[PDB]
Point group: C14
């Protein structure tokens, strides 16, 4: 939506539709105060993800993973957010009867 | 009604009748603070649907589904609201003795 | 009475008698904050009917039904209020010893 | 008395005697906030009758009945108040030892 | 006494003696806020009688009865107060040992 | 004493002695807020007598009796107070050991 | 003492000695708020006597008795106070051991 | 002492010694608010004596006794105080062990 | 000391020594608010003596005794204080172990 | 020390040493609010002695003893304080283990 | 991020990407109020590490280790922060199911 | 120290060293509010000694002893303080394990 | 860091690196309000060490030891802080599992 | 340190190093509000020592001992503080495991 999403959505909206640049599909298991993830390069300001406070640590490339695992369920929360370029593919299917996490996303993210 | 419906109806009204553009038939199992869905392209502002906080996640087309399932009952809450164009067909028949959900709608939605 | 009836009657009054245009016979099982139904085309503002919050959903014609069923009794609360033209025929006979619902109405309704 | 009687009488008074036009004999089982019935054509403002909130519903003629039945007793509360012309004949004899309802009235009522 | 007696007497007084016009003998079983009965033609303002709230209902003549019966005792409370002319004859003898109701009155009453 | 005695005496005083006109002998069983009885013709203002609220009712002459009976004892409380002329003869002998009621009075009373 | 004695004495004093005119010997069983008895002709203001509220009632002459009897004892409280002329003879001997009532008085009393 | 002694002594003092005129020997059983007895002729103001409220009643001469008897003991409290001339002889011997009442007085008293 | 001693001593002091005129030896059993006894001729102001309120009563001479007896012990409290001339001889020996009353005094007292 | 010692010492001090005139040796069993004894001739102001309120009473000479005895012990508290000249010899030896009273004094005392 | 990170992250962000100079990878088991570690040379201000308050003590080189060990788990918290140059290699794998500590970092750090 | 020591020391100090004149060695068992002893000749102001309120009483010479004995122990508290010249020798050895009283003093004391 | 460290570190920081002059390695078991130790020569202000309040007492050289021993463990807390020159070598290894005290320091310290 | 140390140290500091004049080594068992001991010659102000309130009493020389013994342990607290010259040698070794008292001092002290 805006630069910094800064939003609990509350849930999905009038996602300001775009070309894939500014807006990214931040969604996947989320909630844990993520203003926006991706953009801007200025302070989102920052997010926790996975409704946890774990996140991956090794560096993939320049841009490099993070991956809170939420529950025991499949919780491949990635946010390769370095602030270089940026590729991540989320999916989600936890407690099968959930608040539909099923659909999965991918994020592109140029800052440039 | 208005641009942003912004309304709990309270229930159906003097729906400002139209050609199918601005006003859409948002109805179906609803309640969970949906100001308006569809229009405007400006902030409705946003809705939850299904009286839940689930919603579909895969992307259908540009404009792409969302589908909170309310109860266990037939709860095909769709709102393909991308903000491209827009096609969705709702129906509803849950707890058969309900607050008549029976009648079902369809939404058109050009923003253009 | 006025444009927007806006009234709990309290009960029937000096119904401003008319030709069938402005004033309509809103009556039938009612109570659930119906200001006026029918007219105006401007905000009545809106009504619930049937002392419920059910109402019919399919679209009859342009102008199209709504029908809260109040109790289990015969509760054919119709308000075909679209805001096109408008035809509905109410009747009422619930708990036979009631607050006389027996007499039944019909509503005409041109906005034009 | 006045235009709008607007009165709990408290009980019968110096009924401003007339020709049968303005003042009508509103009396019969009453109490339930009837300001005046009949006249004026302007807001009485309105009455309940029968110390109930039932009233007849079918339309007799233009001017047309209403008839709260008070108790189980003979309670032919009519007020054919349309605001056309107007004919009604009340009588009353409920719990035989009552607050004398025995005497019965008739109402004329031209607005013209 | 005055135009509108407007008085609980408290009990009988210096009844402003007259010719039978203005002052009438209102007395008989009374108490229930009768300002004055009879005169004036302007607002007494009004009375209940019989220490009840019953009163006769049929119309005798133009001027026409009212008759709260107080107790079971002989309680011929008449006030034929129409505001035409006016004839009534009260008497009283209830609980024989009472607050002497024995003596009985008659009321004349021209308004003219 | 004064025009309107207006007094609980407290008990007998310097009765302003007279010719029998203005001052009358109001005494006999009394107490029940009698300002003055008799004079003036203007508002005494009024009395109850007999320490009761009974009083005679028939009309003797123009001026005409009233007679609260106090107790069961001999309680011939008369006050023929019409405001014409005026004759009454009181006596008193109740509970023989009383607050001496024994002595009895007579009242004259011209207003003229 | 003064015109109106107006006094509880408290008890006997410097009785302003006189010729028998103004001051009278009011004494005898007393107490019950007697300002002065006798004089003046203006408001004493008034007395009760006998520490009671009985007093004689018949009229002796113009000036005429009053006689509260105090107790059962000899209590010939006279005050022939009319406000004509005036003769009374008191004596007193009640509960023989009393607050000496023994001595007895006489009152003269010209107003003239 | 002064004109009106006006004093509880508290007890005997610097009795302003005199010739027997102004000051008198008021003493004897006393206490009961006697300002002064005797003089002046103006308001002492007054005394009770005998620590009682009895006092003699017959008239001796012009000036004439009063005699509260205090206790059962010898209590010849005299105060012949008329306000003519004046002779009295007190003595005292009550409860033999008392607050010495033994010594006895006499009072002269010219006002002249 | 001063004119009016006016003092509880507290106890004996710098008795302003004199010739026997002004200051007198007031002492003996004392305490009961004696300001000064003897002098002045103006208000001491007055004393009680003997820590009692008894005092002698007969008149000795012009100047004449008073004699509260304090306890049962020898308590010849004299104060012949008339305010003529003045002779008294006190002594004291009560409860033999006392607050030494033993020593005894004499008082002279000219006022002249 | 000063004129009026006026002091609880608190205990012995820098006794302003002298010739025996002004300062005297007041000491011996003392305490009972003795400001100073002896001097001045003006108000010490006064003392009690002996921690009692006994003191001798006879007159020795002009200047003359006083002698509170404190306890049962040897308590020859003398203060011959007249305010003439003045001789006294104190000693002290009470409860042998005391607050050393042993040492004894003598007082001279000219006022002159 | 900034000079002094001064931040609880809250968790990893839009790490202002760099060349390895200013920003360092402070991460590893942390939390214990570390504003920033490394840079600036001005007051970070300072950190605790290891969520403890242990840290290594020997000096490695100029720049020299510190190493809080957090738990019993592998907790090689190094911060060779001298403020010379600076080399440290962290890794982390404690309670294997943790908040992913797995990924490990290295810090470069020139101040120059 | 100062003129009037006026001090609880608190304990020994920078005793302003002297020739033996002004400062004296006041010490020995002390405490009981001794400002200074000895000097000045002006108000120390005064001391108690011996932590008692005993002190010697006889007069040695002009300057003359005082000697509170503190406990049962050897407590030769002397202060020959007259304010002439002055010689005293204290020593102290009470409860052998004390707050060292052992060392003993001597006081010289010229005022001159 | 600063002149007076004045700091609880909180723990080790951006130790302002130096030549060994100003900053010293104060560390070793510490905590007990040591602002800085060593420098400055002006008020650190001062330290306790060893988290105790013991410290060595003999004088080594000019500059001379102090050595609180903390626990029973090896606690060679030295601070030879005289403020001459200055040599001390700390080490630490107490409760082997501690908050790493293991690493040990040495302090140089010229003030010059 | 300063003239008057005036300090609880808190413990040993940046003892302002000196030649042995001003600063002295006050230390040894101390605590009991010693501002400074030794210097200045002006008010330290004063000390207690030994954490007691004993101190030696005999005079050694001009300058002369004082010696609170603290506990039962070896507690040779000397402070020969006269304020002449001054020599004292402290040592300390009480409860062997103490807050190191072991090291012992010596004090020089010229005031000159």
């Amino acid at each position: 939506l805006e630069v910094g999403r800064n939003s609990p959505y509350d849930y999905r909206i009038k996602s300001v539709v775009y070309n894939p640049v500014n807006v990214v599909k931040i969604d996947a298991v989320a909630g844990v105060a993520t203003h926006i993830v991706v953009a801007p390069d200025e302070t989102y300001i920052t997010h926790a993800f996975g409704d946890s406070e774990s996140r991956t640590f090794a560096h993939k490339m320049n841009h490099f993973f993070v991956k809170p695992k939420q529950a025991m369920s499949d919780t491949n929360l990635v946010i390769v957010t370095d602030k270089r370029t940026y590729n991540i593919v989320l999916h989600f299917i936890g407690e099968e009867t959930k608040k539909n996490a099923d659909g999965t996303v991918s994020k592109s993210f140029i800052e440039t």
